[PDB]
Amino acid sequence: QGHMLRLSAPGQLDDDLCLLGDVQVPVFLLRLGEASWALVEGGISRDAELVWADLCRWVADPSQVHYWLITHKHYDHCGLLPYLCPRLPNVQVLASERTCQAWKSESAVRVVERLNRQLLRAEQRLPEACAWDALPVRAVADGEWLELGPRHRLQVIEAHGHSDDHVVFYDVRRRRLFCGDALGEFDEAEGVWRPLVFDDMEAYLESLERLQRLPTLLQLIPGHGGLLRGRLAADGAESAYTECLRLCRRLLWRQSMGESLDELSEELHRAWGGQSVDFLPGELHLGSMRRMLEILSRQALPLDMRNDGGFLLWWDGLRSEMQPIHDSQGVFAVLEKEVRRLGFDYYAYGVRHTIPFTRPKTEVHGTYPKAWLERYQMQNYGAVDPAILNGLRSSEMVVWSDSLFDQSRMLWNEARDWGLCVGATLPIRAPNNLLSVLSVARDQQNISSFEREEIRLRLRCMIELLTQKLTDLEHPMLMSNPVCLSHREREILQWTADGKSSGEIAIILSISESTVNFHHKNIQKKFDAPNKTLAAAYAAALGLI
């Protein structure tokens, strides 16, 4: 440990972690147990004999290395594999499907080897290498839990943007993130991030957005520059997002004055290239500056779908995404997409009708575990569910909390058993006396106050738009009871619900009492009602009069 904020020296960094080789292109070593080890980041080819040396100072046996984690495919994060895997018999390489496929293409591996060979020292000779498609690889998927060791459980997270394959690794026990290049190149002289967007900007920014939601970080480890800790590593993701949008503002401003991509590429190179001269030929750095300046000019918002440039932008984008939809399932799909973008796992949408007064129908549709739907409806938990009933009394969102469920212990216990441990519920009353409710749920993160206030707005807008579209599509869940009254029957009922008898209506409307009672009979027939009272009460409850 130290009082420093950046640890950037070969050797030990934490009670389970070591930096091997050159701090510029480090390889990280994890002690999963007494005789079990793992590696992280693949570094560059030319360090093969350096890295090896350092490794043998900590590990008594290379056969005890069982796993090697690789963020992405670029030549500077997989160059050591072909040379050191022939020495690590028990190792599995772990990479994203795209990465494992990239190692099978002759073209990509040829690029990798050309760039890695450009990096040898004076009269350097390379030790024997094995085929790229001969590596002992096992592909991983987004969200997969890697049970490396008893105290090393790491989650895979897709972080496309930097490249079309990039992934990062979250050690949740120590709140430690291996982020590779997805945040960029850390400026060692200023303390800010240098964006590295080399495939897609929307995906880059959406990835940084999804990463801002992780628990507060204590340790942040990019592919270059060592390990960051404290505040520097806690607000890392937000800081990378900020610096990317700052470069966007710079580029767009310069282009509004008439500058070319190459011009700002040369300007940026002048002030940045100096850091990566040891492992990156200057011309590839300039070309990457030009490439990223290409993408930014393509996808950045000018200065005049759902995304990044302010809230109103997300609002209009959501609306525009929902206009062409003529199929309800797609409506629900878009809603799900935005719910996940908020940071939750499941959601639900419920409608509470006002009748029958003894047992008011409460219909539900969502994406909770189907078995929970079976149990919920089977035991009709939906009658006195606090999340829905709060809407009868308040227009505020209700964040799920033990105190709120004091009256309904069984429901809360069973929902907790199904993973629905954290969530929130917003209510809104449609203009037809209906109680519509929108709930969101996740597994392990409690709603922080700030995110609570954020949610309230985003969910309000989503549910407000959703009910509108479902009314335009006449969904069966909302259709309640399709009853249309004629103008005459409606005003007859308007009088009757005010207490008038057949005779008084006959007088007032200037028609006969027989006509009025026949109208009453028709009205009854529509409501499937046995008398006038049920018709009047349901019509009042349904807003028809």
Place this chain on the structure above:
Amino acid sequence: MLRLSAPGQLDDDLCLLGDVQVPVFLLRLGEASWALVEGGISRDAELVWADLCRWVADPSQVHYWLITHKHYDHCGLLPYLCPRLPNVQVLASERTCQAWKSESAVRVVERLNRQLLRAEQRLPEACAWDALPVRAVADGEWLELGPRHRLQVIEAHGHSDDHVVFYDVRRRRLFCGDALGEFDEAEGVWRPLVFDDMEAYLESLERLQRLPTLLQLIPGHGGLLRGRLAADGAESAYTECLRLCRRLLWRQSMGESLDELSEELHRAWGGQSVDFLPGELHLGSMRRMLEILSRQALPLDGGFLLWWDGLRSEMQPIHDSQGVFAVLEKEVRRLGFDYYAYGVRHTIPFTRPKTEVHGTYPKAWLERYQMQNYGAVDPAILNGLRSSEMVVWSDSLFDQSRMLWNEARDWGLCVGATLPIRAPNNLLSVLSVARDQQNISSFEREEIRLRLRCMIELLTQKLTDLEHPMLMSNPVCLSHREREILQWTADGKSSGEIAIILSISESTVNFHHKNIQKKFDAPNKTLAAAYAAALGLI
């Protein structure tokens, strides 16, 4: 172009006078009424004056002069051009007016302004600093400058302990002085200018992010910004200030002195302000800002959301309804409208449903409205019975009730909108906003719609929490037994079936029916059931 930076007209009501580096802004309030903004530097006195005589036929028509803060580069012209504007009121923050009474502050200003003359110019006649025709303004004060110029004052301490900014709500135009910083003409980003307090600087930028989306942003240096640059101005300035904070903290964690980064910043920034700032004061101000930042920066080991947080914080502590309505007025005028209304439509009597209203239209039109019971057949209110979408006022909407629309137009209520919401007790509450001369432009429409939705939600919540009478409904209370009996009767059950299900006698049940009727002043069971359903009681 995206940045307008040339002397002369900038908009149909605005002109830039003098040097774009230290500009002075001119507003045409009317045919023979004008106003100024920014006090510039002394040495431009004869330049600016020239340009002024190109636009104003008579110098007596200049009636107001607005001053952001006391720095020498925003008040230097006053002693020299106020002697030429007989009818002008200077408008400034109290601290500024006090600074003008202290001999020391005026001496600093005078020395720094003298440093900037050319070896040729002679000084034109000048008046004393404590003799100026000054009028103090207050944070939030409404300045009814002109028929189409209603500007609000906003306190923006931080850059200096007195800084204030001015917001034209009609044009969504903000004069911000230096509270956001010095706009980088070569890069398009903000350079922080923190010369008094960092917390106040950042809180000022926060309060400014809460304004409606900006179309025109006018700092003390560099001209007028439009488009995206003006929308996220406050957000970007906030961000760049925190970026400088982290740069400083990192360098200090490596063992650098402030002098090092101060000289760096001078080398890379001072060139912009060489014409109006002696280089050594630029280095010293960089050092001052880096000192303040090093003092207050946190050690180590989106505008809409801000508006929302601010409104809530403003409306929770209030426990008296009149103040609630007052806050509503504040935000409505801040958006750019003149009057508002809040209405409640009860569901009964079904033939003559009570429609109560509270707002700020001319009392005579309310007399007229109720006199002709316009609340029954007002289309803006009736749209809420079938839709939760906002309604922009339009002839098609009012084709059905032409008389009401014609008379409302006669009173100036020519442009407006109305939002509907359903309180949790089956009441239809609606919120309207209105002005006279400007049509609702497309982008501001959706921004408005959203803000109105939020405001009315919180309003109905708070007034229910305050137990207002207009929301109060017919006071009838039932117990579980009689309530459940009514739940059964409203489901179509007869007296006998109810008695069977509840395990009591039928005489008991019909006597219960009488109980229920007595409260509603109802003649039979049907009226009771319908009113109970309409009131949400069963």
